[PDB]
Amino acid sequence: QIQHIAIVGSVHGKYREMYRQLSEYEKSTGKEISFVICTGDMQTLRYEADLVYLKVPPKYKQMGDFHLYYEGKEKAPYLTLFIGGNHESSNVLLHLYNGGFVCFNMYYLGVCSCININGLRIVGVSGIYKSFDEKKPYTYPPSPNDVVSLFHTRNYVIQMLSNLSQSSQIDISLSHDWPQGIVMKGNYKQLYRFQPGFKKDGASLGSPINKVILNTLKPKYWISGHMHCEYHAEEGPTHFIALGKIGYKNAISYLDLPLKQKTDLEYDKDWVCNLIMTWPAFSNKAQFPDLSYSISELLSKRTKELDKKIIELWEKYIGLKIIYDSDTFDIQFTSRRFYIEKIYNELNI
Ligand code: NI
């Protein structure tokens, strides 16, 4: 039994187009899409006011399609999981830094996380890399002054994600900019033929953060969407795929994977455990993480017994199924941290 998973590069607020194109796939091949994964520049602007948070050049200060979906005028026909890129309503994603549905059928993975679906474990790393900002905390609530920095990937995700392949493998990992160096691991000449501008960066092209995470977790697949081209490469056991932007034929591809089980979208248990155990570093809602704490030090405290109780409590308060919630995003931010804190404090440490 096989599951077909649509994989998409940059959406740029072309949601209706994306869906029509996925619809054409099912009509043209007779296959069913199990779900969709998108690697960024989602531009999930709820209303005109959010334009303030979209860092783009003036000619691209456009609302796009998302608000139709946010309003219920359109309805996404496939469960769509995504990470943030560099063109985002960054305020919305910060409210949802711990993940959340931006609307029915569209689930944001957060700054980073692992989820479960159909027997798969899927890791996500949002943003693009700029060294000047990799140790910057998030400040909350969102401020228009933060438009330039919110979408830069922080170094700390490396510590949050690095233990996630201890108990089983990672099937797919998602990022926006490419893992640094991976450009060298495919037919780069053929690529430079089409993207001569990529050539100056040499092996340094891409995110050192994503390089480390890939070298550490070694997922079956790593999927990325920043570059506006298709590209394939292999780094040991990992299949790298890059995808272009909606409107071009190299934007959408498909993974045909064994389906061992059909199972609703779920929080990953190891991820939940990391999330709870790192709470002390995230305890200040106005500014996090507090890196006077050591993330890996906090995660070193994980135990079999402790993990079990954590999952038990998560199941009690939040549930393992990731379910649609229509409260406003600022309400969700407070609600998810409330329970993370409550769980942590129930552990007694
Ligand atoms: Ni991008």
Side-chain angles (χ1 to χ4, degrees):
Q1 243 197 332
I2 294 169
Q3 68 183 305
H4 309 285
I5 300 171
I7 48 170
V8 190
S10 305
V11 176
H12 288 298
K14 307 302 196 195
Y15 289 89
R16 289 172 296 180
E17 178 49 23
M18 175 173 50
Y19 290 129
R20 292 178 196 129
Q21 183 166 333
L22 302 172
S23 185
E24 256 329 286
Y25 168 89
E26 297 188 307
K27 299 177 225 293
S28 92
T29 69
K31 307 182 185 148
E32 142 185 348
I33 291 168
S34 299
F35 63 92
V36 181
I37 309 175
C38 293
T39 49
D41 297 344
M42 312 301 296
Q43 308 187 191
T44 62
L45 283 70
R46 295 163 302 197
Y47 25 63
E48 299 180 8
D50 291 328
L51 286 165
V52 174
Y53 282 94
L54 173 56
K55 154 71 156 54
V56 290
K59 45 185 281 82
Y60 288 113
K61 290 269 187 183
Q62 294 175 336
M63 281 299 284
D65 278 29
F66 182 78
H67 73 97
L68 274 28
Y69 293 82
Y70 182 73
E71 296 156 14
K73 292 185 168 198
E74 295 285 347
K75 171 177 172 177
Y78 317 90
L79 169 55
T80 306
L81 319 176
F82 67 89
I83 47 152
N86 59 293
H87 292 319
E88 298 295 351
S89 181
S90 285
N91 61 326
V92 167
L93 301 183
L94 183 72
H95 290 298
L96 304 181
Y97 81 108
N98 277 322
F101 283 97
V102 291
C103 67
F104 182 74
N105 261 350
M106 308 200 185
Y107 178 75
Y108 170 55
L109 260 69
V111 175
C112 65
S113 66
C114 186
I115 57 71
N116 293 0
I117 183 169
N118 290 351
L120 296 178
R121 306 177 64 226
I122 307 194
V123 160
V125 189
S126 292
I128 64 167
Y129 180 82
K130 296 277 175 171
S131 57
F132 64 82
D133 274 343
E134 71 187 319
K135 298 288 183 27
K136 201 167 140 71
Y138 292 109
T139 41
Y140 191 91
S143 167
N145 282 343
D146 304 312
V147 63
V148 295
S149 59
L150 276 171
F151 56 87
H152 297 145
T153 312
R154 274 56 175 176
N155 161 95
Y156 81 81
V157 299
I158 295 170
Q159 289 70 63
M160 296 289 290
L161 291 181
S162 64
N163 72 16
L164 292 171
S165 55
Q166 290 307 119
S167 290
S168 66
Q169 83 194 352
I170 302 298
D171 302 273
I172 303 169
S173 176
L174 285 24
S175 71
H176 193 61
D177 48 2
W178 295 12
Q180 186 174 47
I182 200 98
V183 63
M184 304 316 299
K185 289 304 210 300
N187 196 335
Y188 50 89
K189 298 200 162 315
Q190 178 199 22
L191 171 68
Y192 296 150
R193 292 201 272 107
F194 296 78
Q195 306 298 339
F198 296 178
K199 198 170 174 181
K200 101 193 54 181
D201 309 278
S204 77
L205 166 61
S207 166
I209 286 168
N210 291 323
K211 164 218 282 281
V212 177
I213 296 171
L214 191 160
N215 176 267
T216 298
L217 300 183
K218 300 205 197 296
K220 299 179 199 220
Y221 300 90
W222 189 292
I223 303 185
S224 300
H226 196 43
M227 299 309 281
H228 298 176
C229 63
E230 177 134 359
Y231 192 54
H232 299 262
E234 316 286 336
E235 174 58 56
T238 294
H239 306 288
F240 178 68
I241 308 154
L243 299 159
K245 84 185 182 170
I246 291 294
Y248 303 90
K249 170 42 183 178
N250 62 3
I252 306 199
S253 194
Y254 304 79
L255 301 186
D256 304 313
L257 266 30
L259 178 56
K260 156 181 63 169
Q261 67 195 40
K262 178 190 195 174
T263 313
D264 288 354
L265 178 63
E266 274 166 356
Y267 299 104
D268 176 73
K269 298 184 185 60
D270 291 318
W271 171 249
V272 161
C273 287
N274 285 359
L275 192 55
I276 300 322
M277 298 297 280
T278 53
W279 161 261
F282 291 84
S283 74
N284 184 348
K285 76 193 179 195
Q287 166 167 331
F288 50 89
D290 174 358
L291 296 176
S292 72
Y293 295 85
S294 166
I295 303 286
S296 52
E297 197 278 316
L298 290 158
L299 291 167
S300 76
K301 300 187 193 184
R302 276 184 60 189
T303 77
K304 214 219 211 302
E305 309 302 280
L306 236 26
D307 283 350
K308 188 175 188 299
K309 183 72 179 167
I310 285 172
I311 294 314
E312 164 187 332
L313 271 355
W314 183 272
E315 222 174 299
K316 173 178 172 198
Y317 297 130
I318 296 166
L320 280 166
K321 308 291 186 71
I322 309 194
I323 65 168
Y324 181 78
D325 165 323
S326 67
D327 284 311
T328 61
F329 302 157
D330 52 287
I331 297 301
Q332 303 201 33
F333 160 95
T334 286
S335 184
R336 174 64 44 89
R337 289 164 47 91
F338 175 79
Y339 292 114
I340 288 158
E341 180 188 6
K342 172 172 192 81
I343 296 173
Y344 175 83
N345 292 329
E346 273 193 54
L347 297 188
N348 298 306
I349 302 143

